[PDB]
PDB file of C-alpha atoms in Angstrom:
ATOM      1  CA  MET A   1      66.570 -37.771  23.037  1.00 43.60           C
ATOM      2  CA  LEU A   2      64.423 -37.562  26.157  1.00 40.91           C
ATOM      3  CA  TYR A   3      61.823 -40.335  26.237  1.00 38.96           C
ATOM      4  CA  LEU A   4      58.991 -40.225  28.760  1.00 39.88           C
ATOM      5  CA  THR A   5      58.048 -43.855  29.344  1.00 40.70           C
ATOM      6  CA  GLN A   6      55.842 -43.777  32.388  1.00 40.91           C
ATOM      7  CA  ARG A   7      53.260 -41.833  34.325  1.00 42.61           C
ATOM      8  CA  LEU A   8      54.081 -41.785  38.010  1.00 43.74           C
ATOM      9  CA  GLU A   9      51.385 -42.995  40.401  1.00 43.66           C
ATOM     10  CA  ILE A  10      53.173 -40.833  42.958  1.00 41.25           C
ATOM     11  CA  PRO A  11      54.393 -37.608  41.325  1.00 46.80           C
ATOM     12  CA  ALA A  12      57.850 -36.187  41.965  1.00 46.96           C
ATOM     13  CA  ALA A  13      58.781 -32.504  41.756  1.00 45.75           C
ATOM     14  CA  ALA A  14      58.528 -31.412  38.142  1.00 46.17           C
ATOM     15  CA  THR A  15      61.695 -30.479  36.288  1.00 47.49           C
ATOM     16  CA  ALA A  16      59.709 -29.344  33.262  1.00 48.01           C
ATOM     17  CA  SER A  17      56.179 -29.129  31.888  1.00 47.12           C
ATOM     18  CA  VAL A  18      54.499 -29.963  28.568  1.00 41.41           C
ATOM     19  CA  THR A  19      51.254 -28.362  27.369  1.00 39.32           C
ATOM     20  CA  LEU A  20      49.187 -30.674  25.207  1.00 37.90           C
ATOM     21  CA  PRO A  21      45.686 -30.904  23.724  1.00 35.33           C
ATOM     22  CA  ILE A  22      43.413 -33.868  24.395  1.00 32.45           C
ATOM     23  CA  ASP A  23      44.129 -35.511  21.023  1.00 31.62           C
ATOM     24  CA  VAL A  24      47.813 -35.843  21.956  1.00 32.12           C
ATOM     25  CA  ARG A  25      47.162 -36.747  25.596  1.00 34.25           C
ATOM     26  CA  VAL A  26      45.480 -39.954  24.438  1.00 33.68           C
ATOM     27  CA  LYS A  27      48.411 -41.007  22.244  1.00 33.68           C
ATOM     28  CA  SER A  28      51.133 -43.370  23.444  1.00 35.30           C
ATOM     29  CA  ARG A  29      53.957 -42.648  20.968  1.00 34.83           C
ATOM     30  CA  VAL A  30      54.494 -39.111  19.693  1.00 35.64           C
ATOM     31  CA  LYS A  31      57.026 -36.271  19.619  1.00 36.42           C
ATOM     32  CA  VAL A  32      56.346 -33.229  21.800  1.00 33.74           C
ATOM     33  CA  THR A  33      58.131 -30.048  22.853  1.00 34.70           C
ATOM     34  CA  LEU A  34      58.480 -29.094  26.507  1.00 36.53           C
ATOM     35  CA  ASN A  35      57.539 -25.607  27.741  1.00 39.71           C
ATOM     36  CA  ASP A  36      61.263 -24.810  27.977  1.00 36.40           C
ATOM     37  CA  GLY A  37      61.904 -25.602  24.316  1.00 36.42           C
ATOM     38  CA  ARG A  38      63.397 -29.085  24.686  1.00 38.82           C
ATOM     39  CA  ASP A  39      62.321 -31.914  22.422  1.00 38.62           C
ATOM     40  CA  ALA A  40      60.954 -35.088  23.972  1.00 40.06           C
ATOM     41  CA  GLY A  41      59.113 -38.201  22.962  1.00 38.40           C
ATOM     42  CA  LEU A  42      56.133 -39.858  24.604  1.00 40.68           C
ATOM     43  CA  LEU A  43      56.685 -43.633  24.727  1.00 39.78           C
ATOM     44  CA  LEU A  44      53.968 -44.797  27.104  1.00 43.72           C
ATOM     45  CA  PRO A  45      51.779 -47.876  27.498  1.00 43.24           C
ATOM     46  CA  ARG A  46      48.533 -47.814  25.488  1.00 45.90           C
ATOM     47  CA  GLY A  47      45.106 -46.972  26.879  1.00 48.58           C
ATOM     48  CA  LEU A  48      46.125 -43.958  28.918  1.00 48.39           C
ATOM     49  CA  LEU A  49      44.466 -40.569  29.174  1.00 45.99           C
ATOM     50  CA  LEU A  50      47.010 -38.029  30.397  1.00 47.68           C
ATOM     51  CA  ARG A  51      45.309 -35.426  32.572  1.00 50.01           C
ATOM     52  CA  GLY A  52      46.594 -31.990  33.431  1.00 50.30           C
ATOM     53  CA  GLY A  53      48.742 -32.331  36.528  1.00 54.20           C
ATOM     54  CA  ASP A  54      50.009 -35.824  35.689  1.00 55.55           C
ATOM     55  CA  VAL A  55      53.778 -36.254  35.916  1.00 56.23           C
ATOM     56  CA  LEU A  56      55.693 -38.336  33.384  1.00 58.08           C
ATOM     57  CA  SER A  57      59.183 -39.654  33.907  1.00 58.14           C
ATOM     58  CA  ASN A  58      62.029 -41.149  31.924  1.00 57.04           C
ATOM     59  CA  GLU A  59      63.442 -44.606  32.581  1.00 55.88           C
ATOM     60  CA  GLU A  60      66.296 -43.292  34.748  1.00 56.75           C
ATOM     61  CA  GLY A  61      64.049 -41.122  36.920  1.00 58.23           C
ATOM     62  CA  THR A  62      65.986 -37.924  36.282  1.00 58.97           C
ATOM     63  CA  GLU A  63      63.293 -36.018  34.406  1.00 58.20           C
ATOM     64  CA  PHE A  64      59.792 -35.382  35.714  1.00 54.07           C
ATOM     65  CA  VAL A  65      57.515 -33.638  33.242  1.00 54.07           C
ATOM     66  CA  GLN A  66      54.242 -32.109  34.376  1.00 56.26           C
ATOM     67  CA  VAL A  67      51.455 -32.449  31.791  1.00 57.75           C
ATOM     68  CA  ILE A  68      49.240 -29.373  31.353  1.00 53.89           C
ATOM     69  CA  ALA A  69      45.994 -29.246  29.321  1.00 56.18           C
ATOM     70  CA  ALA A  70      46.526 -26.915  26.363  1.00 55.02           C
ATOM     71  CA  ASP A  71      44.036 -24.250  25.342  1.00 51.96           C
ATOM     72  CA  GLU A  72      41.672 -25.619  22.703  1.00 53.27           C
ATOM     73  CA  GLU A  73      38.862 -24.077  20.641  1.00 53.69           C
ATOM     74  CA  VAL A  74      35.804 -24.907  22.714  1.00 54.05           C
ATOM     75  CA  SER A  75      32.161 -23.945  22.989  1.00 54.20           C
ATOM     76  CA  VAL A  76      31.393 -22.836  26.535  1.00 57.70           C
ATOM     77  CA  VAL A  77      28.041 -23.234  28.242  1.00 57.42           C
ATOM     78  CA  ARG A  78      27.986 -21.201  31.429  1.00 58.01           C
ATOM     79  CA  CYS A  79      24.638 -21.458  33.183  1.00 57.57           C
ATOM     80  CA  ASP A  80      23.465 -21.176  36.791  1.00 56.07           C
ATOM     81  CA  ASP A  81      20.492 -23.442  36.073  1.00 55.13           C
ATOM     82  CA  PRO A  82      21.567 -27.055  36.869  1.00 52.41           C
ATOM     83  CA  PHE A  83      18.365 -28.405  35.324  1.00 50.82           C
ATOM     84  CA  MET A  84      19.129 -26.803  31.973  1.00 51.66           C
ATOM     85  CA  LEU A  85      22.720 -28.040  32.127  1.00 52.20           C
ATOM     86  CA  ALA A  86      21.504 -31.586  32.812  1.00 51.99           C
ATOM     87  CA  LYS A  87      19.313 -31.382  29.701  1.00 54.57           C
ATOM     88  CA  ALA A  88      22.325 -30.186  27.725  1.00 53.70           C
ATOM     89  CA  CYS A  89      24.427 -33.081  29.036  1.00 52.70           C
ATOM     90  CA  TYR A  90      21.812 -35.597  27.924  1.00 50.65           C
ATOM     91  CA  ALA A  91      21.559 -34.048  24.450  1.00 51.81           C
ATOM     92  CA  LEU A  92      25.322 -33.934  24.033  1.00 50.65           C
ATOM     93  CA  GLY A  93      25.772 -37.445  25.358  1.00 47.88           C
ATOM     94  CA  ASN A  94      23.155 -38.761  22.958  1.00 47.85           C
ATOM     95  CA  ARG A  95      25.268 -37.398  20.095  1.00 48.84           C
ATOM     96  CA  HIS A  96      28.450 -38.887  21.571  1.00 46.29           C
ATOM     97  CA  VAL A  97      30.091 -35.506  21.969  1.00 45.81           C
ATOM     98  CA  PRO A  98      33.155 -35.552  24.281  1.00 45.57           C
ATOM     99  CA  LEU A  99      32.160 -33.249  27.113  1.00 45.07           C
ATOM    100  CA  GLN A 100      33.758 -31.562  30.108  1.00 42.70           C
ATOM    101  CA  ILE A 101      31.220 -31.205  32.932  1.00 44.59           C
ATOM    102  CA  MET A 102      31.825 -28.701  35.715  1.00 40.14           C
ATOM    103  CA  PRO A 103      29.470 -27.202  38.263  1.00 36.64           C
ATOM    104  CA  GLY A 104      27.838 -24.405  36.280  1.00 37.49           C
ATOM    105  CA  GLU A 105      29.837 -24.841  33.079  1.00 38.53           C
ATOM    106  CA  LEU A 106      30.177 -27.248  30.155  1.00 38.33           C
ATOM    107  CA  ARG A 107      32.882 -27.315  27.486  1.00 42.91           C
ATOM    108  CA  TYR A 108      33.137 -29.265  24.229  1.00 43.90           C
ATOM    109  CA  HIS A 109      35.089 -28.862  20.982  1.00 45.42           C
ATOM    110  CA  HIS A 110      33.525 -25.901  19.172  1.00 42.71           C
ATOM    111  CA  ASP A 111      30.683 -26.912  16.857  1.00 44.67           C
ATOM    112  CA  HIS A 112      28.142 -24.437  15.465  1.00 45.92           C
ATOM    113  CA  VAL A 113      25.481 -27.111  14.930  1.00 47.47           C
ATOM    114  CA  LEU A 114      25.651 -28.249  18.550  1.00 44.66           C
ATOM    115  CA  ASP A 115      25.690 -24.625  19.746  1.00 43.76           C
ATOM    116  CA  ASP A 116      22.452 -23.737  17.961  1.00 40.06           C
ATOM    117  CA  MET A 117      20.814 -26.919  19.173  1.00 40.74           C
ATOM    118  CA  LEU A 118      21.660 -26.048  22.780  1.00 41.35           C
ATOM    119  CA  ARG A 119      20.495 -22.482  22.219  1.00 42.34           C
ATOM    120  CA  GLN A 120      16.987 -23.812  21.568  1.00 45.18           C
ATOM    121  CA  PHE A 121      16.913 -24.967  25.208  1.00 48.60           C
ATOM    122  CA  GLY A 122      17.424 -21.342  26.181  1.00 46.89           C
ATOM    123  CA  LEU A 123      21.115 -21.779  26.902  1.00 46.81           C
ATOM    124  CA  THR A 124      23.708 -19.110  26.148  1.00 46.39           C
ATOM    125  CA  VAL A 125      26.620 -20.674  24.273  1.00 47.35           C
ATOM    126  CA  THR A 126      29.903 -18.800  23.925  1.00 45.05           C
ATOM    127  CA  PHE A 127      33.406 -19.548  22.682  1.00 46.15           C
ATOM    128  CA  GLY A 128      36.852 -19.702  24.200  1.00 45.73           C
ATOM    129  CA  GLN A 129      40.444 -20.910  23.900  1.00 44.60           C
ATOM    130  CA  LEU A 130      40.478 -22.963  27.095  1.00 46.25           C
ATOM    131  CA  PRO A 131      41.883 -26.219  28.496  1.00 45.00           C
ATOM    132  CA  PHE A 132      39.636 -29.192  27.694  1.00 47.20           C
ATOM    133  CA  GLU A 133      39.244 -32.149  30.075  1.00 45.32           C
ATOM    134  CA  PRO A 134      36.381 -34.349  28.808  1.00 47.92           C
ATOM    135  CA  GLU A 135      34.759 -36.967  31.032  1.00 47.00           C
ATOM    136  CA  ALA A 136      36.488 -40.339  31.239  1.00 40.97           C
ATOM    137  CA  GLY A 137      35.494 -42.733  28.477  1.00 43.94           C
ATOM    138  CA  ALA A 138      35.277 -42.203  24.726  1.00 48.04           C
TER     139      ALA A 138
END
């Protein structure tokens, strides 16, 4: 069984990739399946947040697996008004909602209640199956 025990500070050329959602990327010990079909097990130190692009390796340094953020069901807030987005960020932060903040776009796990609340600010909230990279800190 392939065990990925560390995240390289300096990545090496990937030999495989693994596409995982945020809930798995914050776990230290769990079974996963690589993009190529192979089984593998995460056996990392605690307190890590694996980000898309990170490269994990096995003890022997013969396997280098590139982590990729999986598509997740998210609410999307695309808006060219930075002021309105800032208001949305405050509202979402006040409710402790994990949030991905990008210039002109916000993403969070789909939630109808939060969507309608943001819509009252005049924001257009849509839906998508997209990678989710929430801001550091939970």
